[PDB]
Amino acid sequence: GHQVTREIAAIPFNLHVNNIPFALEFKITGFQKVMGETQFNGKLADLKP
């Protein structure tokens, strides 16, 4: 009510629709713990009496 501005506005008009009630969901974590560190000899080193 007290200022004039030119407003150029873009109004989206679309819809996302799913068809197939099928999915498999995996939570994959820990890449660095396997490729960065030891897995085989590191474990054998723990067995020293």
Binding site: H2, Q3, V4, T5
Partner: protein, 49 residues
């Protein structure tokens, strides 16, 4: 206690959005009426004969 404590600026806006319109001008006109009165007469009498 020698120190600068405060300041004032001459900052002003840029009314590109024309928020402030300042003073307003309008055209006006006045009317004065001067009616002319009648004034007392001057007469001279003379006889009719």
């Amino acid at each position: 206690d020698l120190a600068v404590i405060g300041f004032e600026l001459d900052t002003r806006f840029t009314n590109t959005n024309r928020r402030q319109r300042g003073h307003l001008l309008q055209t006006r006109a006045l009317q004065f009426r001067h009616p002319i009165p009648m004034h007392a007469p001057v007469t001279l009498p003379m006889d009719t004969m």
